[PDB]
């Protein structure tokens, strides 16, 4: 009985694969980017990427190829998952609706077979007769492609070559032929086979098995005009066809392994190659020919083009542009040019796409001492290495702050016709209007002719033809720029009050109840036009001359009072078109029409807090999409502000929201304010682009960040960070980091590019003498990072061949000082289980790093949490507990040795600890008895752990290596010295990700219990919470209902997907829910949703609310 919830906080950002072709249309260039469990679909444009579709799958995409057989309009997509789910996908659009379809599927795992070295490789023959796969050593799996075979059924063929490296289907082959580099004892060899389904055997290929180099590793098959295979080694590259053999050994490739190729030119005259380094090569097939007779290949060469982010994926797109698929660092768009500018790099970066990288460690914050956590992560590796601060929501920067418990609206007035700046703020008040002539940045409250000061203003626009406007309770006044007095002033013919305002800069519409008017500020006076009553009382009115209108404004939209409805109308007529009869006894407190990139929209906030958004047609004007969304428990006021181009809508509530503009959609990100009542743009000669905000009591004005739900700040490190600690008292982070450096002309090491550790403000090296007994080495550092500036305050360099591996920041013993302790490891390529290392105690002084204490140790200090005023530390197989003398030294009390390799420890305040490497997780207490360790319980499963966290006194979370999560707890059991000694895995789950780090923290706040964040190798941030048995059940059941109803892309059983699974065991998930699934709910049509309820109670949309309440834990 363990009960948990897991949700994505940020999807994986690492790019796992990518591919190009025409999957959208026969005449349209798509790039498909595979993240982990996400397919991204783009059209390549002149600008770059137009996003088209972002589907998920129930699987880690292992194979992604586009293909097209005979009689096929556009490229089908083949996908093999890691759990061996194969499928074939087709891009389908119903004019406005986009759907990816499953043309076939089948699971292709074989109960037999070991999964080979070098992983899954699927492939596809040029003629599209079939799909060849290599999953298992010895076996090659063949899947004929035929109109039928919708189940992708497949035979195996035996393969003498037990240890294949890479394989491709050769071009221009009468028979389906494959080409493969295999490795036996003798070396590595290229070989071929024709492939016949006719009789489920191979035959022989068109050419003798040749040889290839010891590190040979990529096969490339060159298209029809050339044929044959390009095979890429280390320090070398070669070509093969029948009798032809071409070779090259440019030293320029020697320094790093090529790692991806991609063809540029269909003929294959040109190819791109990427590197462990980021270097981008161009591999050219020197042209050549001999009259009537196909093109030969005289030669081939490498041209270093420059540098990219480290590339998993590479894909030439349109003209000179290349997408660089990165997993170790940020992905990017990148222009190649015939000319190499400064530095001599034909490769200029165009776009850079954020990868939260492999997140190697991370921590909450803890910055502007507010109450929300910023998450700070060590990311990337090598030169992509970085920190990334991640802050949920959109912040705003406050300049002035006038405490005003009234403000009931506010409007943006310039007092000088010329200047784009507004030096006045007129604001609705407690049945009043205060004016604010600002002396630039200074506040001062005075009169202003024709602008009533004893009247609750309800509007105040910037009306053209040199005039000002002030709609009050009473009369819709008018004031001049030339005269500046009472130019006009309207007044209802009966002495009746205006109930609801409206205006832009030329158009004027008021209402008095059910009544409607319409005025115009025609030079120096208000002339009326229409009048029309309505069913019920006018709740709200929107009008802004949208697209094809300059001041004068097309159609109209309205919310009424008894029937609680919102309805599309026109103008001088006032003719009712289509309408919606929204439910509820609560009135639409605000209606809005707008424009964005290329679309018009109708938005309606009610007073319950919830909202309805719909799309308007400047021409036609009718329905769109029914779907309400809760936000500010208090009526939402909607406005529109200055930002950039896509200028957007601000939602004022208890829960202030912005509404962005996604993939031509509209974002719904939180704003980091206490509350907002009303809000408007600005530009004073002393408060430029700022939106003034007003709450219960206070005016405020400032800029607005980007948008995207979440914001990400990035400290580029150039080297590869490893661990990281915040030491608040000293307002900085320590970060363990490593760079790499070469052996010199004798042994010394240089420093290719500058990194954070060499560009440091100050610096250090270890003096300590505790020891005494081309080539790449690592150099490791503690870094002091200013929390405010993210400057490398100080760098401490560690000893030759010493590894910092663990980092704490704590106070120790009675000692009222706070240290950065660092566990380390003396690492030589001779052994493989360090026998020496150290614990070092640092202090960071005024601007200073004082090596306070060191401690030799007889193994690698893997992890070390601060225990209980003492220092607990894992020292290779043996966990120890060090105390801090008064006389300032780390000295032992106890150790425990029942550890194959203690990699991870964590501490629930109490004298309780937990961890391990290949035999997943022990629990241990510390005994104020013989100040000792009593091993309370382990878990007797063979889990190769990666991360480990304590959720509560009983619950222990672990991540491991198949990408599985599992929870453990202590067995409440009779016979309490056995069933006791054994804790049971009472929650299992296949996550789909490698978890490096857990931590208690949350991204949110100023249903669920606890909040543990996680960072993955893929840049996914998850979150794990605990559950009441009842929510569990509600949700567990809901999980099942939800899956009968959702069309899982490639027809993959969700439950099959989430199934705890190693290559030696497969159990269904228990004690876990993907909120990711749960949340799938909301993206569902109401019909499909109603279905989900067939049966304390069971409703229909009480849940629509339950699910919302959760989306809000991250």
């Amino acid at each position: 009985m363990s009960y948990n919830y897991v949700v994505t906080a940020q999807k994986p950002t690492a790019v796992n694969g990518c591919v190009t072709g025409h999957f959208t249309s026969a005449e349209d260039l798509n790039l498909l980017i595979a993240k982990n469990t996400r397919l991204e679909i783009y059209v390549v444009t002149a600008e770059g990427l137009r996003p088209v579709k972002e589907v998920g799958m129930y699987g880690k995409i292992a194979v992604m190829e586009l293909f097209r057989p005979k009689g096929e309009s556009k490229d089908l997509l083949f996908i093999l998952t890691a759990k061996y789910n194969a499928c074939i996908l087709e891009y389908k659009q119903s004019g406005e609706s986009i759907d990816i379809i499953t043309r076939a599927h089948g699971n292709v795992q074989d109960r037999i077979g070991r999964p080979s070295e070098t992983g899954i490789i699927g492939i596809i023959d040029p003629e599209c007769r079939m799909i060849g796969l290599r999953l298992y050593d010895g076996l090659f799996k063949v899947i004929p492609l035929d109109r039928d075979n919708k189940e992708l059924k497949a035979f195996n063929i035996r393969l003498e070559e037990l240890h294949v490296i890479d394989v491709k289907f050769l071009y221009g082959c009468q028979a389906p032929t494959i080409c493969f580099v295999y490795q036996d004892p003798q070396g590595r060899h290229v070989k071929t086979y024709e492939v016949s389904l006719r009789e489920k055997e191979f035959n022989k290929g068109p050419w003798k098995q040749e040889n290839v180099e010891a590190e040979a590793s990529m096969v490339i098959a060159v298209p029809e005009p050339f044929g044959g295979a390009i095979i890429i080694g280390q320090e070398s590259i070669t070509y093969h066809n029948g009798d032809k053999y071409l070779a090259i050994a440019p030293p320029i490739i020697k320094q790093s392994t090529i790692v991806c190729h991609n063809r540029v030119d269909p003929n294959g005259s040109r190819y791109l190659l990427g590197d462990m380094e980021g270097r981008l090569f161009m591999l050219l097939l020197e042209k050549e020919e001999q009259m009537d007779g196909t093109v030969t290949l005289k030669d081939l060469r490498v041209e270093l083009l420059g540098e990219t982010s480290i590339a998993e994926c590479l894909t030439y797109l349109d003209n000179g542009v290349v997408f660089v698929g990165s997993r170790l660092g940020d992905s990017q768009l990148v222009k190649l040019n015939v000319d190499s500018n400064e530095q001599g790099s034909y490769v200029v970066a165009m776009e850079t796409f954020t990868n939260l990288g492999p997140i190697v460690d991370m921590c909450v914050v803890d910055l502007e001492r507010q109450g929300q956590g910023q998450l700070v992560t060590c990311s990337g590796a090598f030169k992509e290495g970085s920190l990334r601060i991640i802050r949920n929501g959109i912040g705003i920067h406050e300049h002035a702050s006038i405490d005003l418990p009234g403000i009931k609206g506010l409007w943006p007035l310039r007092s000088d016709p010329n200047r784009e700046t507004y030096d006045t703020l007129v604001l609705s008040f407690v049945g009043q209007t205060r004016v604010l002539m600002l002396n630039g940045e200074e506040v001062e409250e005075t009169e202003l002719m024709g602008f009533v000061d004893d009247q609750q203003t309800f509007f105040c626009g910037n009306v053209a033809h040199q005039q000002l406007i002030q709609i009050t309770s009473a009369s819709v006044r008018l004031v001049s720029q030339e005269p500046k007095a009472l130019v006009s002033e309207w007044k209802e013919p009966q002495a009746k009050n205006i109930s609801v305002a409206s205006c832009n800069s030329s158009q004027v519409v008021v209402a008095v109840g059910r009544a409607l008017y319409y005025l115009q500020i025609h030079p120096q006076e208000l002339r009326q036009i229409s009048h029309t009553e309505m069913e019920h009382e006018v709740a709200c009115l929107d009008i802004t001359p949208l697209g094809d209108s300059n001041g004068l404004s097309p159609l109209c939209a309205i919310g009424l009072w008894t029937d609680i409805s919102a309805r599309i109308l026109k103008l001088p007529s006032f003719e009712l078109l289509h309408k919606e009869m929204l439910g509820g006894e609560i009135i639409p407190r605000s209606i809005l029409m707008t424009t964005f990139e290329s679309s018009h929209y109708l938005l309606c906030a009610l007073g319950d807090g919830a909202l309805f958004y719909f799309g308007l047609n400047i021409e036609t004007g009718l329905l769109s999409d029914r779907k309400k969304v809760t936000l500010g428990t208090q009526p939402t006021v909607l406005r529109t502000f200055r930002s950039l181009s896509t200028t957007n809508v601000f939602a004022c509530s208890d829960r202030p929201t912005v509404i962005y503009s996604s993939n031509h959609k509209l974002v719904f990100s939180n704003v980091n304010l206490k509350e907002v009542n009303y809000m408007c743009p600005l530009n004073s000669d002393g408060y430029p682009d700022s939106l003034a905000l007003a709450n219960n009591s206070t005016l405020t004005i400032g800029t607005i960040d980007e948008i995207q739900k979440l914001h990400i700040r990035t400290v580029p490190l150039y080297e590869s960070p490893r661990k990281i600690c915040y030491q608040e008292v000293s307002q900085c982070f320590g970060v363990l980091s490593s760079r790499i450096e070469v052996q010199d002309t004798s042994g010394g090491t240089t420093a290719l590019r500058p990194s954070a550790s060499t560009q440091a403000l100050s610096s250090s090296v270890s003096s300590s003498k505790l020891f005494s007994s081309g080539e790449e080495v690592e150099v490791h550092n503690l870094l002091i990072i200013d929390q405010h500036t993210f400057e490398v305050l100080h760098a401490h360099q560690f000893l030759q061949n010493e590894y910092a591996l663990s980092l704490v920041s704590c106070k120790l013993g009675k000692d009222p000082n706070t240290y950065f302790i660092v566990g380390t490891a003396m690492v030589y390529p001779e052994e493989a289980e360090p026998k020496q290392g150290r614990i070092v105690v640092f202090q960071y002084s005024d601007g200073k790093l004082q090596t306070v204490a060191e401690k030799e140790v007889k193994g690698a200090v893997y992890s070390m949490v601060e225990f209980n005023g003492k220092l607990l530390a894992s020292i290779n197989s043996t966990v120890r507990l060090y105390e801090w003398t008064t006389e300032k030294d780390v000295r032992t009390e106890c150790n425990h040795y029942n550890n194959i390799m203690a990699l991870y420890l964590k501490t629930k305040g109490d004298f309780i600890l937990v961890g391990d490497l290949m035999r997943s997780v022990l629990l241990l207490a510390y005994k104020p008895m013989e100040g000792n360790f009593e091993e309370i319980a382990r878990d007797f499963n063979p889990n190769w752990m990666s991360a480990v966290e304590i959720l509560d006194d009983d619950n222990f979370l672990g991540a491991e290596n198949a990408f599985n999560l599992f929870v453990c707890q202590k067995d409440s059991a009779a016979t309490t010295d056995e069933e006791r000694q054994h804790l049971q895995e009472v929650g299992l789950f296949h996550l789909g990700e490698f978890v490096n780090v857990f931590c208690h923290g949350s991204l949110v706040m100023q249903p669920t219990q606890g909040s543990v964040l996680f960072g993955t190798v893929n840049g996914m941030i998850g979150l794990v919470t605990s559950l009441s048995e009842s929510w569990y059940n509600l949700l567990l059941d809901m999980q099942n209902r939800l899956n009968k109803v959702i069309k899982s892309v490639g027809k993959i059983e969700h439950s099959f997907w989430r199934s705890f699974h190693t290559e030696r065991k497969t159990e269904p998930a228990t004690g876990f829910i993907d909120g990711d699934l749960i949340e799938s709910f909301l993206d569902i049509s109401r019909p499909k949703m109603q279905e989900v309820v067939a049966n304390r109670e069971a409703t229909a949309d009480d849940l629509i609310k339950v699910v919302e309440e959760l989306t809000r834990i991250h």
Partner: peptide, 13 residues
């Protein structure tokens, strides 16, 4: 050594 092999893992393939 495991160290290296523990890195390579924390950082995928």
């Amino acid at each position: 050594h495991l160290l290296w092999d523990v890195r390579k893992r924390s950082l995928g393939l």
